[PDB]
Design a protein around this ligand. Structure first.
Ligand SMILES: Nc1nc(C(=O)O)c(CCc2cccs2)s1
Ligand SMILES: [Zn+2]
Ligand SMILES: [Zn+2]
Length: 241
């Protein structure tokens, strides 16, 4: 407790660690959850991923702050004890990139969509060290994503932001929609202040079609859900046109 305003509440299978919560989703994948205190509003949860690939760890998204992001690094040290090779950050918003400085201090190599890096300062964020670029079909250009192990990085098109990207984990049932996807019971699409209302639905559908195998859809502001989250996000976006 650890009692949010937005996101998922605490449930069995979670493990608190400082101001953060971790939940194991598969033998080599964990969800990290960190909360931001907005006075007069309360605690907003954001979720990222931690992936063990052989003998290194790969991180998807920072926490809201450097301090929380260092805490993720200490949790990895305590529970995994393997070098953190890289992190991919999924768009230039505080919940996904607020802790870049913490990663760069610890020697972790960071990657973001080129557009995220160009947006980053405008959005109050530090840029990743390296820019991912994408084919017209949305798949990352492989030269720009070296040694990514099982991470399959897809740009689905503009949606929650124009720069939003997504990540599947090969050899698991998991794909990460980030802030693009909301849960199957959600009543809205979260913050649309930077959203592309015309193209959102196509981009949600493109996410689903790019990772057709995954059955566990992880997302930034809700607990992991089924593929229903994808079709539900897409219908809710259909109303935006
Ligand atoms: N930093 C923040 N990101 C989002 C987002 O939608 O990605 C926010 C809104 C959170 C909510 C999602 C669904 C209902 S509220 S805040
Ligand atoms: Zn965002
Ligand atoms: Zn968000």
């Amino acid at each position: 407790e650890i009692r949010p305003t937005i996101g998922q509440q605490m449930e069995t299978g979670d493990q608190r660690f400082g101001d953060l919560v971790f939940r194991q989703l598969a033998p080599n994948v964990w969800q990290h959850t960190s909360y931001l205190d907005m006075p007069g509003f309360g605690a907003v949860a954001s979720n990222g991923l931690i992936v063990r690939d052989g003998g290194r760890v790969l991180v998807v998204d920072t926490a809201w702050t450097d301090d929380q992001t260092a805490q993720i690094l200490n949790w990895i040290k305590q529970e995994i004890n393997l070098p953190v090779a890289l992190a991919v950050v999924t768009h230039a918003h505080q919940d996904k990139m607020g802790g870049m400085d913490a990663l760069h201090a610890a020697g972790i190599a960071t990657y973001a969509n080129a557009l995220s890096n160009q947006l980053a300062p405008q959005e109050g964020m530090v840029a990743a060290q390296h820019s991912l670029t994408f084919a017209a079909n949305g798949w990352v250009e492989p030269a720009t994503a070296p040694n990514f192990g099982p991470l399959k990085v897809f740009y689905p098109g503009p949606g929650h932001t124009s720069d939003n990207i997504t990540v599947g984990i090969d050899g698991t049932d998991i794909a990460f929609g980030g802030c693009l996807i909301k849960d199957s019971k959600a009543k809205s699409l979260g913050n649309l202040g930077d959203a592309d209302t015309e193209h959102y639905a196509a981009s949600a559908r493109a996410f689903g079609a790019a990772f057709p195998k995954a059955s566990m859809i992880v997302m930034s502001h809700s607990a992991p859900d089924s593929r229903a989250a994808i079709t539900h996000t897409a219908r809710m976006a259909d109303k935006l046109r």
